[PDB]
Amino acid sequence: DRLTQLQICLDQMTEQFCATLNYIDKNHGFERLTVNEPQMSDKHATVVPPEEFSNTIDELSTDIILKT
């Protein structure tokens, strides 16, 4: 039964990896190289506040290593 929980933990690693990649691919924003360049927004783009963006990055990372 222990190996079964191990396999569940292994594909939970893989699901966490693809979920973190999906989150960082979809919910990232648009970064200013300089201040004079135009910052435009898209209604079809899921924009998030950057501080809670980093907080979600942190909690995704910490759940990865607590599962580890």
Next chain:
Amino acid sequence: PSYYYYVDPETTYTYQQPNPLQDLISVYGLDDISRQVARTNLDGTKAVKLRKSYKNQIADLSGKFSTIPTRENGKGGQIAHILFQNNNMSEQQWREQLRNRDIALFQPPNFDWDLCSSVLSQFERSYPSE
């Protein structure tokens, strides 16, 4: 020391070519295209907004036009389909052959001029108004 799988010190990786980190407008010399259409000038001053129509392009020609011929006003046509149609001797001679075979449609018997003189002479007096 224990070696770890697929962590090899001699294995190295480089940046993407071209690198999307840098402003790829400047890498390919496209900055001239950038600020010529920019909505704001890069000195804090707002630049002029481009017009909705091309009236400013055609503003330098004197004609009878006051509106803009579009698809939806019944003034233009599906001309792009026609415009996207496609078909010893030196390069001078061969280019002469190409340019002259592009002249054979431009002369009689394709465009008989006596026929056009007689036909447009058929227009009677005055302009009927519709």
Next chain:
Amino acid sequence: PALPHVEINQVSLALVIRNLTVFTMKELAQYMKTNVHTQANEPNSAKKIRFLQLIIFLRTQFLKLYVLVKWTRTIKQNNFHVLIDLLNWFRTTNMNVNNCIWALKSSLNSMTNAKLPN
């Protein structure tokens, strides 16, 4: 740097100038041959109206050509294909981060058939 040049859905300006010229005098010829004979169905006043409509249409087409040549005059270095190749490179690269994700997901879906349960 190297960019894969795309040859899809472009055309030379000489080709569209040639196409417009052959089209305009082909339409001139086609209006020419149909209006040789005058009947009650086609009075010469209606012939003049049709000629006015055709010359207005040709003026419209050459105005479009004028706008096109002005637009080509706006670009100085004639490097619009560089911009198109850069965008097609962007289209390839944006999918690559999705492509590795889908590679991992396909790896998992092929992995599901390979366990050994309790």
Next chain:
Amino acid sequence: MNGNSTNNEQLQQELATTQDQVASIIESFVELGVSIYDFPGTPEATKGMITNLQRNVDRLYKLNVRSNDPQSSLSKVDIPLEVVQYIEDGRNPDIYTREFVEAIRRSNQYQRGKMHGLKQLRDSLADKIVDEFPELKEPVEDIIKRTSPIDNVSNTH
């Protein structure tokens, strides 16, 4: 670059002469159009509009032969269908350049944001791993220096 520069200069001269020939054709068209609308019915006006057609046809000769001569950069001009069908809508073609370069910049900034987000995920993961696993700190730092190489195509902006 010298060949490209003189090609662009000769191309600009060709564009200017095509534009003035097209302007002459359009002026001749409005002249013969108002001649048709203000027709006096005379044979002289018939010959005049014949003459207008004659100058239009020989202008078409001159700008067709310049569309096929060997010394032509008009073949080197790259034109998509979207700009010509964009003009046929009656709506301004410099917007196509404006919106097109804005799409370039928008995609570049989307990619740069994804780039920085991947960097944040990477180094947060690295710091957290070396916090949990002290025995793995040397391979993690080796991976970091391997996967963050010295910038030779990033120092330029």
